[PDB]
């Protein structure tokens, strides 16, 4: 999780799309969904990013409906956003034991217990936190088993990006679980 603002510059695709759903949270605007192969994934927008401005207008106090209407009406050519990096989230680095375990139990992407004397214990992983990213790959909406697969087929260093469950649940409210698995960009970014 970077420490400052960044500016990003999008262009709507052929279909006048950018691949973004936004959510009003505590009088700010946050990224709820980044669509695979969209302008918003190509420029590197993430789940949980805060949008401070759209085309130099402040988003403070906008409804989810208004932010969406603003993106709709924008002159396509070039949209500028001022982004604050995933401010509700944190990154923990752990190391698999010789048995390949980092040392937690999770259910519906939510960490529920920390195993005694694991890397997860030594690194202070918390329960009641949703897993957002593993090794910078977004896993929101994947089945628990696919999350285990990504952990398995990670090497012995495992970086996990987590969000307190109350905040997570407030962000995904009103978005169909099926859109999450289907359309939430789960890919490793392109170079």
Curated annotation (Swiss-Prot):
GO terms for molecular function: cytoskeletal anchor activity; frizzled binding; identical protein binding; interleukin-5 receptor binding; phosphatidylinositol-4,5-bisphosphate binding; protein heterodimerization activity; protein sequestering activity; syndecan binding. A 1,2-diacyl-sn-glycero-3-phospho-(1D-myo-inositol-4,5-bisphosphate) binds at residues 108, 143-144. Keywords: Acetylation, Cell junction, Cell membrane, Cytoplasm, Cytoskeleton, Endoplasmic reticulum, Lipid-binding, Membrane, Nucleus, Phosphoprotein, Repeat, Secreted. It is a peripheral membrane protein. One of its GO terms (biological process) is chemical synaptic transmission. It is found in: Cell junction, Focal adhesion; Cell junction, Adherens junction; Cell membrane; Endoplasmic reticulum membrane. Induction: By IFNG/IFN-gamma in melanoma cells. Residues 7-86, 91-166 form the PDZ domain. Expressed in lung cancers, including adenocarcinoma, squamous cell carcinoma and small-cell carcinoma (at protein level). Widely expressed. Expressed in fetal kidney, liver, lung and brain. In adult highest expression in heart and placenta. GO terms for cellular component: adherens junction; azurophil granule lumen; blood microparticle; cytoplasm; cytoskeleton; cytosol; endoplasmic reticulum membrane; extracellular exosome. Signal peptide: none annotated. Its main location: other. Changing residue 107 to A: Disruption of the cooperative binding of C-terminal peptides from FZD7 and phosphatidylinositol-4,5-bisphosphate. Phosphorylated on tyrosine residues. Monomer and homodimer. Interacts with SDC1, SDC2, SDC3, SDC4, NRXN2, EPHA7, EPHB1, NF2 isoform 1, TGFA and IL5RA. Interacts with NFASC and PTPRJ. Interacts with SDCBP2. Interacts with PDCD6IP. Forms a complex with PDCD6IP and SDC2. Interacts (via C-terminus) with TGFBR1. Binds to FZD7; this interaction is increased by inositol trisphosphate (IP3). Interacts with SMO. Multifunctional adapter protein involved in diverse array of functions including trafficking of transmembrane proteins, neuro and immunomodulation, exosome biogenesis, and tumorigenesis. Positively regulates TGFB1-mediated SMAD2/3 activation and TGFB1-induced epithelial-to-mesenchymal transition (EMT) and cell migration in various cell types. May increase TGFB1 signaling by enhancing cell-surface expression of TGFR1 by preventing the interaction between TGFR1 and CAV1 and subsequent CAV1-dependent internalization and degradation of TGFR1. This is Syntenin-1. It comes from Homo sapiens (Human).
